[PDB]
Amino acid sequence: VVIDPSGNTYYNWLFCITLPVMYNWTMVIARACFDELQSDYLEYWLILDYVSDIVYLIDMFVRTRTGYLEQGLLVKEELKLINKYKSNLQFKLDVLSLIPTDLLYFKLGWNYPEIRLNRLLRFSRMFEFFQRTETRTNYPNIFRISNLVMYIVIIIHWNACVFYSISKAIGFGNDTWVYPDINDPEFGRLARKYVYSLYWSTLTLTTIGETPPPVRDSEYVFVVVDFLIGVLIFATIVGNIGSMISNMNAARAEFQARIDAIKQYMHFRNVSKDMEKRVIKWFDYLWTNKKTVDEKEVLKYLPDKLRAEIAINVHLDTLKKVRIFADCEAGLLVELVLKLQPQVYSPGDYICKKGDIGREMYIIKEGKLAVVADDGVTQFVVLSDGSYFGEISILNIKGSKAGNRRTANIKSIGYSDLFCLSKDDLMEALTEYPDAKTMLEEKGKQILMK
Amino acid sequence: VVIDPSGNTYYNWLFCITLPVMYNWTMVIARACFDELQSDYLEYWLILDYVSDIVYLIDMFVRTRTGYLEQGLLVKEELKLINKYKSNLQFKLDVLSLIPTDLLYFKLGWNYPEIRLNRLLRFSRMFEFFQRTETRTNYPNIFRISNLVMYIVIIIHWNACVFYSISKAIGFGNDTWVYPDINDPEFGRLARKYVYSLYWSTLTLTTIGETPPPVRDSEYVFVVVDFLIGVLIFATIVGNIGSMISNMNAARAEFQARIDAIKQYMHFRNVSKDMEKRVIKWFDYLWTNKKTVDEKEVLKYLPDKLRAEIAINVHLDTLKKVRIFADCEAGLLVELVLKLQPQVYSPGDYICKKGDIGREMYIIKEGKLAVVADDGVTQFVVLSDGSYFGEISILNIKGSKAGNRRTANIKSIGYSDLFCLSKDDLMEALTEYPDAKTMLEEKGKQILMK
Amino acid sequence: VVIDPSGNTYYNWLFCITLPVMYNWTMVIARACFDELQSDYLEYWLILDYVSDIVYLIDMFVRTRTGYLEQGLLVKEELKLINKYKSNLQFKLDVLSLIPTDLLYFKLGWNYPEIRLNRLLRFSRMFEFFQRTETRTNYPNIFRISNLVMYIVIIIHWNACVFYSISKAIGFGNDTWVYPDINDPEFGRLARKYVYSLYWSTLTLTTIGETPPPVRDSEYVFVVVDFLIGVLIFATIVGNIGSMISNMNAARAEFQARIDAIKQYMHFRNVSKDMEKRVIKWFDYLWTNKKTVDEKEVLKYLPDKLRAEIAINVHLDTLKKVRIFADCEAGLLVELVLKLQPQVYSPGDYICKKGDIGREMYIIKEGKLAVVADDGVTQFVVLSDGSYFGEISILNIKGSKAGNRRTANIKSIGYSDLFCLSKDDLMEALTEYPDAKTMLEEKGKQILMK
Amino acid sequence: VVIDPSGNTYYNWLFCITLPVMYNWTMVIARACFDELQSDYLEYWLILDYVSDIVYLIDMFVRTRTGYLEQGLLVKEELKLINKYKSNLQFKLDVLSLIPTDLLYFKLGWNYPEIRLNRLLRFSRMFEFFQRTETRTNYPNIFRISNLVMYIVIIIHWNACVFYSISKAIGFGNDTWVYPDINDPEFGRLARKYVYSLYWSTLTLTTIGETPPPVRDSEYVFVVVDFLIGVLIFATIVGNIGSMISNMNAARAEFQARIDAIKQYMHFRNVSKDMEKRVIKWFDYLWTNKKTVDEKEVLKYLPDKLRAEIAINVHLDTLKKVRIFADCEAGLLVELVLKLQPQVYSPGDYICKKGDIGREMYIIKEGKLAVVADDGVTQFVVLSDGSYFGEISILNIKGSKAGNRRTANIKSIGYSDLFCLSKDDLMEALTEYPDAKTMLEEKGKQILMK
Ligand SMILES: Nc1nc2c(ncn2[C@@H]2O[C@@H]3COP(=O)(O)O[C@H]3[C@H]2O)c(=O)[nH]1
Ligand SMILES: Nc1nc2c(ncn2[C@@H]2O[C@@H]3COP(=O)(O)O[C@H]3[C@H]2O)c(=O)[nH]1
Ligand SMILES: Nc1nc2c(ncn2[C@@H]2O[C@@H]3COP(=O)(O)O[C@H]3[C@H]2O)c(=O)[nH]1
Ligand SMILES: Nc1nc2c(ncn2[C@@H]2O[C@@H]3COP(=O)(O)O[C@H]3[C@H]2O)c(=O)[nH]1
Ligand SMILES: [Ca+2]
Ligand SMILES: [Ca+2]
């Protein structure tokens, strides 16, 4: 065997089947409308159509060999897959899109390729590929815009073909509206035919209108309907363009809107230009160093038993340098990684101060912190990455003259990325295995006596 | 009896009255402006107008026979309904729209059907039908787009009629702007008249402008006002189109935006392509198997005493296979169905692990789980649908060497849809009837000894 | 005083000063550009300009006599108000807009009314009136759309005047682009002048372009700049139109989106058409009876000491029929009115059932409820409006064989609007005055014995 | 060293390098396409190009001398900065944009300035400056709109240059579509050349289309592609304009939407016009006095150890007049400034009333309050700014006949801005230093006895 739709093989086949479906959606109508296209390159159209039909057949086979999830397990029983396929509307659409209507080439002649129009009924495969690509691609907005542009181009191409067909029905050159006479040297070339039809279609759907006005009632009606199709469908698609660009700007726009609200508040309250500059510097840091997004709000949509792995694969850089995690229990790190709230501190920010509520443990992910003196400048100890502080005031200790108080003040030399671990959480998670707690308050007593 | 507006009969009548109202809103102005329309098909217009008026009268009768809610009860007293009708502005509008202005046909002649313009004053019924359909239809966006297209078409039709009337007032063919001379063979046909007027209207309201420029001051003024009506009203309607397409994409766009934020985080943090593929697979599963929507956020707008029924009608498939619910008390299932949080687990995800906080009971809705050994591969027990686990570590038990600990580790073979029932909730809800609890810890002791 | 800007007198004056400001913003540029406008109606323009200037002077006086809030109190000291006025930029703008530039009529002649262009510098007053109207009017969206249309019209009018002025500078009729020769009988009329200039302006700003193309470099540059002004500013304004219509649809669109999510869930889960019809009926009820909006989310932006008055003025209809409130303490009703959560129940919905957690007291605002038998049909007692139930299981009672249990089952005959009062809240709020509690458990014992 | 990108020097250099990048992005294509531009002002183009290249070199030097943050510290080691630069793609782009392609002037002649097209590869610097300006400027929306207008102008300019180049390739005047013959006196001027090309570009990108239709297939194709570029890219940019105006209106629109929901509720519930006027007055006050924004929601994105400084720099005006803060401990004010919830009370609003739950302490930021008698009018004490009340009922006091009760009723004479400090918070924060608490209940006893 089976293909496992989640796999890469299924996605690759989705591409390989979208190619014929897109080809069919573009060219069947073109060949049906522009007769010279069908006739001049008939030897190539036959090859391409037969290859497309072969790929359609192989796609039907793949649909027979693609497993589905019952009880969460991939069904691998062949006949079960055949039944699941045939019971779905997709099998009906596939049989309809693979009906050998090409036999009508013997009746209607080689000049009627619209018999292959049923081949469009595999559009679903194409759309599936798109909805898969949009999910799996690393450039979701580039692909989304390319998809919208493809839809625009297909719509304009189809409307060009429709215009040319209507000109044919009315008669080429019978009036100033229809496509001019084919017998003209310049206006008889297939290139000119298609490109002028596309020009007309673009002017009509984009509602520019710089085309000869209608002459007949059918022409007036078609032009009204087509200008309305233009207005509505092009507003739809080119406003989807707008929404895609909006969601492209979503993060940056939200960040900038927050900054603007802050600046409005500061200018209204006449906040000192010192503090205004400090705030602007904080936000410039958040942007430049790519910290505007908070991983919590993003990863909250992941499963906890997958977001856990995510956090581990991101923070194993530091949670191996820490003494508590991955050293004593070697598994405890998972119990708290999904609750280590990542904070960022500016240069000179006092994370801790003597005589404060010690309700948070900190793990230094990045940055240089200092166990300073209360004078403000004298740096007693420099804590680099992997260090952990703020854990002594969490625990119950014998001989602690300072209970629930910070034993020292910790300031940040530079921008520090820390993991604030709350006291309640450390309490709750160390209950399972105190084999790490013993050396934890080993460190605790050792630092509390000195 | 009375009609009970909530019923299907009332909605069917809403359709049957919207038909004449729509007919009146489309055709009265057309016949008033295009005199040949009124004259040539007068025998049909008379029949249709009289049928419309009869339906208007029957709609007034229905309004007299439609109950309203006082004290939440449907008023069935006839005279009370007559008073409620006559006291509402709707009765005034109905009498105004049913005034026999057709008598003016004897004074103004058969060439003045705008006397029936008062018939438009039942627009409310039409709109009511729409606002009912949008609520009750299964295709809300299809109907909404059809409604907007109907508004566009009606506006363009009315503007075409207005253009033709203005041409008539100025005189057909008196200058290049107005509709050409009626005496022309081609430009005198009612078909050509209406269709060219519609063409002009479309070019003006869509602001394409490929029409002969005005000549007189009245023409310049009307064209300015009409181009502005075009800009404003068509932006309104065709931006409502945009918002409707947006809300069509709302679920998919939110899902894809979450996926994009996740992928941005993973690529920025250089998350391993293993875990990136796992996350993409999780999201592909959520989409393909239609799990992107969380029933909680959707059904939270339902009444609890209706959302309860909803959850029952959805989850009675599994809550009959469970041993606790619908078996001992047979009513307890409602006390917890509105708090069974549905979770989804990937293949191989450890739902439970030995030595963890047993604070959640799980009911396997769909999927195969395994009571494995801690080695990781040896599957002791396979739990299929209807099974419940994680309930032993919830309860107070005699002789439990493992208190508040998982007696075994449960992993998911495939994608498991479970119902996580919190410990606090099971505690709170079993307090009412311990007739099920006794066999609950029957199972508990039986599994805790073996 | 003083005038007290919050008062109605200040708003009326805002209108009376917006009239000259709007007049000045519309007509000064018109008279400056269309010389015939200035000249032909000079006797009227002089009167209107002098009246506008008098009103400007009276507006300056009002600004001297309008109090401001210092320490939250309206300043009534005259000289303090004069200082507050003169210290503001508004005084500078007012003196600039009232500078007697009309004296230049003696130097530049009566054909130069753009000397009155400084009169536009009172635009602020106009805008203030708008921002006041939008706040105080009952039709905020009608006024907002009218304001946007006024901006559109003013922009188009100004661009028409600019086009005519540029034609004058280049010379009327010197090329096909500029306004045609004034000496023409038809193209020399002030009506034709202004209306064709407005036509050109509309075609340019709405970017239709059906105007003679530029000839000179200045014309090309102006047309480029004006088409870009068109694109940008008209997108701005006519997209503000879109956002205004969106916020017009905001409530209805949110309601309908909730209904659509519900219907999607129900159709996906194959919810029985019984329950689907019940849900659709619930939502039809919510809409038809105007219950889609929840007063909590709306009134949460009001002050509690004003939202309290709001809730009182709305619910004094029923909280006078209740026995506890406005009867014993006569002031207790305010302590709980801001926490009476309004619920709606469908016909047949069991609000209470025997043997359930009695943690909510209910006050029947509207609707008929029944104290039924557990059989389901036998109605023991019918509770109409003003009745209160679910209070016995809240209180501590002697001789209650049923503790924390519902003494009877309450069902809703029809759609009941109730006030669910939580047990914790009744406990917390009755602590202040048990003078009502005594008769409360009077009723309690009386019903618990029978 | 180093430059410290957060500093003002780096931003100034960002401007000084954006000037050549913008110059290059505007003029290289212009000179490449309009040959007369390159030739006539070659002496000036050479100077400007060499100055631009010198500034590019100095920008490369700056990039070598700009520190980056490792461990949150600004790297000042020269060679480390050289490595960080050369290891980034920016160094590749800078070397590519500074390659001396001007040497090709000796081969291709002075008429080929597109060899300087590589100079566009420093676009990043320009964009960086923009993203810095948008952050640091006080007019974020003005700058954003200016940036979008710059993008529009650059796109139109580039498309004008492209049109002129295509006309050159096809041949000037070979058909009606291309730019006319250069040999024409009027259509040969560089001014006319560029300005008509810009006119064509504006008509095409804004999709007005009032230009001669294409003649050749290449012209038709280019016009189709360019009209589509117009539609898509101009919708993008001029809808970004819409979103920028939306976020300009965001605060005012949210405020007005809240007011509209309130007014809809009040008119639907038939709220008395007294209370409707009171609510409208409250909202008029909120707007006029600039209180629609709540500093909590804005400043919650700031760091707590920066939002603290913000609140201090804003509220030190009053927290120096208070007796508790900045007087006894002199540091306690920071422990509670981030939890002082700012409330606003209308004139006559009873903040406190005798016999109520004293769970909030109030600090009068602005406004006159009264310790009144319960009669309602007799004002015992007038509390101005700096005063604090509601603190007696917070504390545990000996001899308090009124426990957890308000000792008096406090009403607001005028609009009072207060700081509501919750009881729990005062309890929690005074635990650290009771040196202020002693005089706190000094005041407490002193007022409780009298
Ligand atoms: N007092 C003290 N604290 C230190 C030293 N080195 C690291 N620390 C950390 O500084 C922290 C300050 O807050 P805590 O008292 O909670 O915990 C303290 C220790 O974790 C040291 O040498 N002396
Ligand atoms: N230990 C054990 N647990 C089982 C077995 N079969 C099912 N389970 C479930 O596995 C669950 C693991 O978590 P709990 O200990 O809370 O509850 C356990 C039982 O509900 C079994 O055979 N042995
Ligand atoms: N048992 C009983 N309850 C009644 C009667 N009339 C009204 N009620 C209300 O029905 C309510 C059901 O819930 P509670 O027991 O909390 O409170 C009960 C009473 O408030 C009655 O006649 N008998
Ligand atoms: N009773 C009384 N209260 C006063 C007086 N002056 C100020 N107050 C304040 O009024 C407040 C009312 O609420 P509290 O009793 O909590 O605290 C009271 C005091 O803080 C006074 O003279 N008498
Ligand atoms: Ca257009
Ligand atoms: Ca046009």
Tally of helical segments of chain A: 16
CATH architecture of the domain at 297-449 in chain A: Sandwich
The CATH superfamily name of the domain at 297-449 in chain A is Jelly Rolls
Order of helical and strand elements of chain A = HHHEEHHHHHHHHHHHEEEEEEHH
- The secondary structure category of chain A is alpha+beta
Oligomer: homotetramer
Shape designation of chain A = elongated
Sheet with the most strands, sense and barrel status of chain A:
6 strands, antiparallel
Find the count of extended strands of chain A (DSSP E, 2+ residues): 8
The whole-angstrom Rg of chain A is 34 Å
Strand-residue fraction of chain A? 5-15%
**Which ions, cofactors or small ligands are bound in this entry?**
cyclic guanosine monophosphate, calcium ion
N-end to C-end Cα span of chain A:
68 Å
The CATH topology of the domain at 297-449 in chain A corresponds to: Jelly Rolls
Assigned CATH class of the domain at 297-449 in chain A = Mainly Beta
What share of the residues of chain A lie within helices?
Answer: 55-70%
Q: Biggest interface pair, residues each?
A: A-B, 56 and 76 residues
Organism (chains A, B, C, D): Homo sapiens
Transmembrane segments (chains A, B, C, D): 15-36, 47-67, 93-111, 117-135, 143-166, 190-224, 225-249
Binding site for 3',5'-cyclic AMP (chains A, B, C, D): 406-407
Site (Central gate) (chains A, B, C, D): 234, 238
